[PDB]
Amino acid sequence: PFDYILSGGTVIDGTNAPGRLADVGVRGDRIAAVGDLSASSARRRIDVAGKVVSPGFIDSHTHDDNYLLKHRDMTPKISQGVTTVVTGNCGISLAPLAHANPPAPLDLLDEGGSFRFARFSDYLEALRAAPPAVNAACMVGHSTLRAAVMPDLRREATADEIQAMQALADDALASGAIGISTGAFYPPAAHASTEEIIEVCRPLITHGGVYATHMRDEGEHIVQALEETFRIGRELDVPVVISHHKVMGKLNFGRSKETLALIEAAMASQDVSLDAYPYVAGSTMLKQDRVLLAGRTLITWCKPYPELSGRDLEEIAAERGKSKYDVVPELQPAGAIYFMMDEPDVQRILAFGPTMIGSDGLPHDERPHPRLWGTFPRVLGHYSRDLGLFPLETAVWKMTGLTAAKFGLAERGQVQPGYYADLVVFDPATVADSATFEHPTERAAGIHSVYVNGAAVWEDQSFTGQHAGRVLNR
Ligand SMILES: [Zn+2]
Ligand SMILES: [Zn+2]
C-alpha cells in the first residue's frame, strides 16, 4: 500500500504543461504513482480538492549554508514551499575556512564563530549527521577559498596560492560539492583575475560540476562582466549560472533588453543559465558603492551601532553630516537593502524563458529583505496569477523542473512516478507573499503542506519536526 495519496487536486508536474486533475501516491521517499489512484490501496487519502500538487520548490540561490546547521527547521524556506536549497553562492561558502572574523561579505553567514570547518567534507558530514528540513545542494565559494589561502587578498593569487585553492576546490567537489561559485564584485575577490578564476575552477570538468557567479559588475560594466562570464564558461567547458540577474542603477534601467539578448545569444553556443528574485531591491553587506547607495537604502544589521538596524541610511548619514557613501566606513561591518532596480527590468528578467527563481535570502539578518520569506509565493501569486506574467505551470517550472535540470538534481523537480517525493500542496487562488519590507518575516499565504523525501515538513502552518532533508550530489 502507498503511505498516502494526495487526492482530488490538480497536478502541475514541473514539466511546463497545464495542470491536470490527478492524485499523487507516495511510498517511503518516492512518488509511487500519479493519476486516478482510487484503485490503489493507501494508508491515508488526504483531500486536496481545490489545491495544486506540484514538485517542491528548489531555491536556486541561497545563502543558507550556516542556517541549515543552526536552524534546522528552515522555516523561512519551507513555509514558502521550498524543499531543496542551493548553497555557497557568490563566492561565499561557509566551508572550508576556520576564521573568527571572516571578511565581508562572508559575515552574512556568520552567527559568531560559525566558520569552524577546516575541510568542506567536515561541513557536509555535519549536515548529514543533523539533517535540516530541506535538501541541500552545496557549492564551494572562491572568496572563501581566497580567505583560507591568501595572506593578502588585495592582489591576484600567485601560482602557489592558485594551487592551494584548486586543491581545496577539488577536495570539496570530491566530497560532494556540486560546483564552485565566484563573486569578484566583492572585496575579497575584486583583485582576482579572470585567469585565476579559471585555474581554480578547472576541476569542475572532471567532477561534472557547475560554475556559478555573482558577476563582477551588474551596472555600467555589465556587458564586460557578462563577456567575462561567457569566456570563463568556454575555458572551463562546464555549465555557467548567472546569479540574481539585474541591471542596477538609474543609468542602467531598461538595459535588461540588452543583457537578455546577450545571454540568449550565448545560450545558443554554450551552456548558460540564470536566476533572479522578484523584487526591485537588493541586499548584501553595507558597501561604499556609488550605485548601490544612490537610492533608498535600509540597514539590516550593524555591528558597531546595533540600534541602527531597520533605519533609513539617508537619515543616518544626513544626521552625521555625510552622504551615504561617506558614512559607510564608520558603520561597518553592517548589512543593507538597496532600492536600485526598476520594475520593468525585473519583470522582463523573470519572464525571460530560462530564468529560474532564487530567493537570495540572507537569513541571519536582523531586519531582512522580505525575499527571504516571500519569493516563491510572490512568483506564483502576484506575478503569475495577479499580473499574468506567465501561466501558473510556467511559474512552477521556473522553480522546479527547470532548476533541477540545470543543477543536475536527479529524480527531483517533477511529479513523476519513481522520482523523490519533494512536493508542495498550495491553493492557486490564495497563494501569496505576505512578507513586506515593513514586516519581512510574515509567513506566506496559501501554502497548505510541504513534503521532503516523502515526509511532511510543513503542515498546519508549522514545522512538523521532520528532519527529512538530504545532502545532494550532482
Ligand atoms: Zn548570493
Ligand atoms: Zn550575489
Side-chain angles (χ1 to χ4, degrees), residues 1-473:
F2 297 161
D3 291 327
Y4 58 93
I5 290 168
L6 297 173
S7 65
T10 295
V11 168
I12 290 184
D13 69 10
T15 71
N16 206 1
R20 62 191 189 276
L21 290 167
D23 306 326
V24 180
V26 172
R27 184 190 290 109
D29 61 2
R30 305 288 180 160
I31 295 166
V34 181
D36 174 354
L37 305 178
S38 49
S40 289
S41 173
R43 296 185 188 286
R44 302 160 62 202
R45 210 173 290 267
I46 304 169
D47 177 23
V48 296
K51 313 286 198 296
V52 163
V53 179
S54 69
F57 311 147
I58 301 170
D59 191 346
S60 69
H61 195 282
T62 82
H63 294 288
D64 291 339
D65 308 41
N66 193 37
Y67 207 77
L68 292 161
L69 295 166
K70 306 296 189 290
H71 300 286
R72 296 167 67 193
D73 54 284
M74 288 296 292
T75 301
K77 302 310 180 70
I78 62 172
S79 66
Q80 309 182 226
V82 172
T83 54
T84 295
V85 294
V86 176
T87 69
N89 287 105
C90 310
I92 308 167
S93 56
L94 182 64
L97 174 66
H99 200 305
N101 294 279
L106 278 57
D107 55 356
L108 295 173
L109 305 180
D110 208 349
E111 290 200 338
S114 303
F115 285 77
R116 71 179 184 84
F117 299 101
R119 298 170 301 206
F120 200 82
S121 56
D122 295 325
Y123 167 72
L124 298 178
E125 290 163 9
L127 287 178
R128 298 190 192 102
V134 299
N135 302 302
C138 308
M139 291 188 288
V140 61
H142 167 250
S143 292
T144 297
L145 299 178
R146 286 180 130 244
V149 169
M150 297 177 70
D152 174 13
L153 303 162
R154 308 180 66 184
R155 59 163 172 75
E156 181 183 24
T158 61
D160 285 341
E161 288 167 341
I162 289 174
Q163 287 163 26
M165 287 189 285
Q166 183 253 39
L168 290 173
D170 186 66
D171 292 338
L173 295 162
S175 302
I178 69 157
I180 301 161
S181 71
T182 65
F185 169 72
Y186 292 115
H191 292 263
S193 63
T194 305
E195 286 301 335
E196 170 189 326
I197 287 170
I198 290 168
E199 299 290 359
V200 170
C201 294
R202 303 263 182 212
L204 289 172
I205 197 180
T206 317
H207 294 277
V210 301
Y211 170 83
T213 181
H214 175 137
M215 297 189 297
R216 196 177 295 264
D217 179 76
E218 298 186 299
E220 183 184 347
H221 301 288
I222 195 172
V223 170
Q224 291 64 44
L226 282 161
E227 287 305 331
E228 177 186 24
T229 294
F230 304 146
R231 171 64 188 275
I232 291 168
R234 290 185 295 273
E235 298 310 325
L236 293 175
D237 194 30
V238 303
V240 301
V241 177
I242 292 165
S243 298
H244 49 54
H245 187 48
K246 67 176 67 65
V247 290
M248 52 176 278
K250 284 177 178 170
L251 290 165
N252 303 296
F253 288 180
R255 295 186 66 207
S256 56
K257 286 179 291 293
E258 162 190 5
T259 62
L260 292 173
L262 291 173
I263 292 168
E264 191 182 307
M267 287 171 166
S269 59
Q270 62 186 96
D271 193 334
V272 183
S273 297
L274 77 170
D275 63 47
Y277 52 82
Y279 301 84
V280 297
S283 186
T284 184
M285 60 178 289
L286 181 66
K287 185 176 190 213
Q288 267 200 314
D289 180 307
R290 311 241 178 232
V291 181
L292 286 178
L293 300 169
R296 182 185 175 206
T297 301
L298 308 179
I299 296 300
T300 56
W301 60 272
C302 175
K303 184 185 192 61
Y305 302 106
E307 73 278 359
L308 301 181
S309 296
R311 284 199 70 185
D312 178 82
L313 183 61
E314 177 63 24
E315 211 179 69
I316 292 162
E319 289 168 29
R320 275 168 191 242
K322 296 182 189 179
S323 63
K324 289 178 225 125
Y325 185 97
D326 292 338
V327 83
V328 159
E330 74 200 69
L331 306 181
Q332 289 178 137
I337 287 167
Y338 306 105
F339 285 81
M340 38 61 162
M341 292 168 287
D342 201 39
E343 185 70 24
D345 290 307
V346 176
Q347 290 187 18
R348 190 179 290 110
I349 291 168
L350 290 170
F352 178 64
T355 300
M356 298 172 291
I357 308 308
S359 71
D360 203 3
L362 303 182
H364 298 104
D365 286 8
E366 179 65 30
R367 294 306 297 166
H369 187 306
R371 65 198 188 188
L372 171 66
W373 288 84
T375 287
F376 299 87
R378 187 166 176 78
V379 171
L380 302 171
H382 179 67
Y383 284 110
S384 180
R385 179 189 64 233
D386 302 330
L387 289 182
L389 192 65
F390 21 56
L392 187 59
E393 62 273 20
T394 299
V396 168
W397 171 78
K398 285 170 163 282
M399 56 184 71
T400 58
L402 170 62
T403 311
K406 301 306 191 73
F407 286 95
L409 309 179
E411 302 182 306
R412 297 183 191 275
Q414 296 182 36
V415 184
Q416 299 289 353
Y419 274 43
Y420 288 105
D422 292 342
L423 300 163
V424 182
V425 180
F426 69 90
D427 187 325
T430 62
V431 62
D433 57 312
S434 300
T436 59
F437 286 99
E438 173 187 45
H439 296 124
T441 65
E442 303 309 309
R443 280 60 166 164
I447 300 297
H448 174 277
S449 49
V450 182
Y451 298 83
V452 175
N453 294 126
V457 294
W458 186 254
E459 289 193 301
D460 298 310
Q461 288 302 106
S462 175
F463 171 47
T464 62
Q466 295 294 316
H467 293 108
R470 292 173 194 176
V471 170
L472 309 186
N473 300 135

